[PDB]
Amino acid sequence: EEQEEDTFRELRIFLRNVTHRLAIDKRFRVFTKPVDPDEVPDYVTVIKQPMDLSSVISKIDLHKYLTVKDYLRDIDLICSNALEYNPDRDPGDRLIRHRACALRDTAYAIIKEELDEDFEQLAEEIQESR
Amino acid sequence: CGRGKG
C-alpha cells in the first residue's frame, strides 16, 4: 500500500538529481533540448522517437518512470538516436557522437555507483504486479 | 544516417 509510492517518490528524487547532473554538464548541452526540426529538417526521416534531457525531466515529474531501467531506456534512446542520425564525417559529427556515448556512460556510471540494487529490484517488481 | 547538423 503506502510503501509502494514511497519507493516511487524516492526514485523520482534520485532520477531528478541524476538528470540535473547530466544536464548541467557542458558536454551534454546538445542533449538538453529537443532537436529542432527547423534546424535539422531531415531528422524526422531518420529518428522515429526523439528524446532529450528536458523531456526526461518532464517525464520524471509526470511519473512516467517507475524504474531506473525505464529511465535508462530513455538515456539509451538519446544516445542511440544521436548515433543513428549523425554521420561520422566532420569533427562536429564525431564530437556529438562521442558526447552521446559519454552521456550514456556517465548516466550508467552514476547509477552503478549510487543506486541500491535491491531498491531498483523492488521498483521493477512493483511495476510488474501493476 | 541523416544529413548531419550544422
Swiss-Prot record, chain A:
Limits of the Bromo domain: 2-114
Cellular compartments annotated: Nucleus
Superkingdom to which the source organism belongs: Eukaryota
Tissue: Highly expressed in estrogen receptor positive breast tumors and in osteosarcoma tumors.
Protein name: ATPase family AAA domain-containing protein 2
Induction, as annotated: Up-regulated in breast, uterus, colon, ovary, and stomach tumors. Induced in breast cancer cells overexpressing NCOA3 or treated with estrogen. Down-regulated in 5-fluorouracil-resistant derivatives of the colon cancer cell line HCT 116.
Function: May be a transcriptional coactivator of the nuclear receptor ESR1 required to induce the expression of a subset of estradiol target genes, such as CCND1, MYC and E2F1. May play a role in the recruitment or occupancy of CREBBP at some ESR1 target gene promoters. May be required for histone hyperacetylation. Involved in the estrogen-induced cell proliferation and cell cycle progression of breast cancer cells.
Annotated S-S bridges: none
Subunit text: Interacts with ESR1 and NCOA3 and these interactions are enhanced by estradiol. Interacts with acetylated lysine residues on histone H1.4, H2A, H2B and H3 (in vitro).
Name of encoding gene: ATAD2
Coiled-coil stretches noted in the UniProt entry, renumbered to this chain: 1-16, 108-130
Range within the parent protein: 979 to 1108 of 1390
Protein family: Belongs to the AAA ATPase family.
